[PDB]
Write an enzyme that holds these catalytic residues in place. Structure first.
Site, PDB file in Angstrom:
ATOM      1  N   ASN B  44       0.839  -1.082  -0.128  1.00  0.00           N
ATOM      2  CA  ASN B  44      -0.135   0.074  -0.014  1.00  0.00           C
ATOM      3  C   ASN B  44       0.920   1.251  -0.125  1.00  0.00           C
ATOM      4  OD1 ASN B  44      -1.265   2.320   1.346  1.00  0.00           O
ATOM      5  ND2 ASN B  44      -3.107   0.677   1.217  1.00  0.00           N
ATOM      6  N   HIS B  55      -3.512   0.719  -3.271  1.00  0.00           N
ATOM      7  CA  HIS B  55      -3.546  -0.236  -2.225  1.00  0.00           C
ATOM      8  C   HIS B  55      -2.627  -1.185  -2.410  1.00  0.00           C
ATOM      9  CE1 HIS B  55      -8.125  -0.096  -0.402  1.00  0.00           C
ATOM     10  NE2 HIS B  55      -7.385   1.083  -0.365  1.00  0.00           N
ATOM     11  N   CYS B  87      -9.922  -3.514  -5.196  1.00  0.00           N
ATOM     12  CA  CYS B  87      -8.686  -4.609  -5.539  1.00  0.00           C
ATOM     13  C   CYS B  87      -9.453  -5.847  -6.093  1.00  0.00           C
ATOM     14  CB  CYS B  87      -8.133  -4.733  -4.282  1.00  0.00           C
ATOM     15  SG  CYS B  87      -7.052  -3.211  -3.794  1.00  0.00           S
ATOM     16  N   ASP B 148      -7.985   4.627   4.315  1.00  0.00           N
ATOM     17  CA  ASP B 148      -7.652   3.559   3.169  1.00  0.00           C
ATOM     18  C   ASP B 148      -9.028   2.584   2.806  1.00  0.00           C
ATOM     19  OD1 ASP B 148      -5.683   0.823   2.954  1.00  0.00           O
ATOM     20  OD2 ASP B 148      -5.258   2.719   1.747  1.00  0.00           O
TER      21      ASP B 148
END
Ligand SMILES: O=C1CCNC(=O)N1
Ligand SMILES: O=C1CCNC(=O)N1
Ligand SMILES: [Zn+2]
Ligand SMILES: [Zn+2]
EC number: 3.5.4.1
Lengths: 151, 151
Positions: B44, B55, B87, B148
């Site tokens: 990340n 990420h 992702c 995040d």
């Protein structure tokens, strides 16, 4: 919807800029729904940067910089092309509520409808400027296009 | 699962390296299932590069570079943490058939199950080293963690 002409115009401007640079002509921008301010704009950088992840939507989010999660909650992500599964995932992760799409004729993934299943609003404008520029790229550089969608 | 020990070890090394650099401790790597070769590895880069998109899994794919689509079809993506929706989308877009996950205790998205509905194989190794380092990051820096994951 009041900023949709503005957002698609900026996204198309980015796609045209990327085309001039030798890349895939896909552009985008993220706009705050309240005041129409542009948080960021970008285009696909596969060729410009040898990038396997900077699709137009991803480049756009990268260009907005780090943001608190709440900021995304009342934005619209404009993209000249219907989002692939990766870009769809990005819209979902940040909880961007609206995705306005230039066209889904040259390309569409299961992500356009998955966004709707997940609760987002999807608007397809059917913008001919976007269709023309992507069709040209696909006709002239099909191998480069297939690589961009992992085919 | 022949290369799973190898891949999760590399992914953890990346997570540990990102931790040392001051970032989110999530790492990954992409391995060719045929010969065990490492196509690329990463972690990340939110803090390191002020990135909203890097990420661990995305940084890993970026590090593998441009690849023809067929290459991804016989690989496994190792990630120390269960993939978020973004992702997950990258894995689906490139058609990476297999995703080996360090742990899904500190975090799990709708993507783990979506990968399976889309035909991908998900293996959760439940690695204690990964759980420990991510539990620590979430405990010490809760606000950075929420950012995040777009919360
Ligand atoms: O998500 C779309 C599809 C393909 N390429 C691109 O940049 N955007
Ligand atoms: O996909 C996961 C989720 C959160 N952050 C990260 O880098 N990996
Ligand atoms: Zn995409
Ligand atoms: Zn992620």
């Amino acid at each position: 919807s009041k900023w949709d002409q503005k957002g698609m115009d900026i996204a198309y401007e980015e796609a045209a800029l990327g085309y001039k640079e030798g890349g895939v002509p896909i552009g985008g921008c993220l706009i705050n729904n309240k005041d129409g301010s542009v948080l960021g704009r970008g285009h696909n950088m596969r060729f410009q940067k040898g990038s396997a992840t900077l699709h137009g939507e991803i480049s756009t989010l990268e260009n907005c910089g780090r943001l608190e999660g709440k900021v995304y909650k009342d934005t619209t992500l404009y993209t000249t092309l219907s989002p692939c599964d990766m870009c769809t995932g990005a819209i979902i992760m940040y909880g961007i509520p609206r995705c306005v799409v230039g066209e889904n004729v040259n390309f569409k993934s299961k992500g356009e409808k998955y966004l709707q299943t997940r609760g987002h609003e999807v608007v397809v404008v059917d913008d001919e400027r976007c269709k023309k520029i992507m069709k040209q790229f696909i006709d002239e550089r099909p191998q480069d296009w297939f690589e961009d969608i992992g085919e």
